[PDB]
Amino acid sequence: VYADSFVIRGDEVRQIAPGQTGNIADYNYKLPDDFTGCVIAWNSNKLDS
Amino acid sequence: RFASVYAWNRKRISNCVADYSVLYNLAPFFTFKCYGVSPTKLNDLCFTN
């Protein structure tokens, strides 16, 4: 298993899932259609912002 | 202005080429799904009306 760490906007959480496309989904990070597993997202407004 | 739901309006689009790139650029897109088509393949399709 591999782990990838990054922080994105709230509006871009829907494009992370494989099969979707977008400005961040096509130029920053992409996932294969046969992706196995799941991603975990939690708010960092307290810490990052 | 947008008309009310009980008085929903309707506009006819024909004899023109529409680009969906100028549409997807809108940031606050939250609810967006398609039944008979796929959003990723809407830039290479033709419609009678």
UniProtKB/Swiss-Prot annotation, chain A:
Changing residue 11 to N: In strain: Omicron/BA.2, Omicron/BA.2.12.1, Omicron/BA.2.75, Omicron/BA.4, Omicron/BA.5, Omicron/BQ.1.1, Omicron/XBB.1.5, Omicron/EG.5.1; complete loss of interaction with host integrins. Residues 9-11 are annotated as: Integrin-binding motif. Attaches the virion to the cell membrane by interacting with host receptor, initiating the infection. The major receptor is host ACE2. When S2/S2' has been cleaved, binding to the receptor triggers direct fusion at the cell membrane. When S2/S2' has not been cleaved, binding to the receptor results in internalization of the virus by endocytosis using host TFRC and GRM2 and leading to fusion of the virion membrane with the host endosomal membrane. Alternatively, may use NRP1/NRP2 and integrin as entry receptors. Binds to host ACE2. RBD also interacts with the N-linked glycan on 'Asn-90' of ACE2. Cleavage of S generates a polybasic C-terminal sequence on S1 that binds to host Neuropilin-1 (NRP1) and Neuropilin-2 (NRP2) receptors. Interacts with host integrin alpha-5/beta-1 (ITGA5:ITGB1) and with ACE2 in complex with integrin alpha-5/beta-1 (ITGA5:ITGB1). May interact via cytoplasmic c-terminus with M protein. May interact (via N-terminus) with host bilirubin and biliverdin, thereby preventing antibody binding to the SARS-CoV-2 spike NTD via an allosteric mechanism. This is Spike protein S1. It comes from Severe acute respiratory syndrome coronavirus 2 (2019-nCoV). The chain holds residues 395 to 443 of 1273 of the full protein.
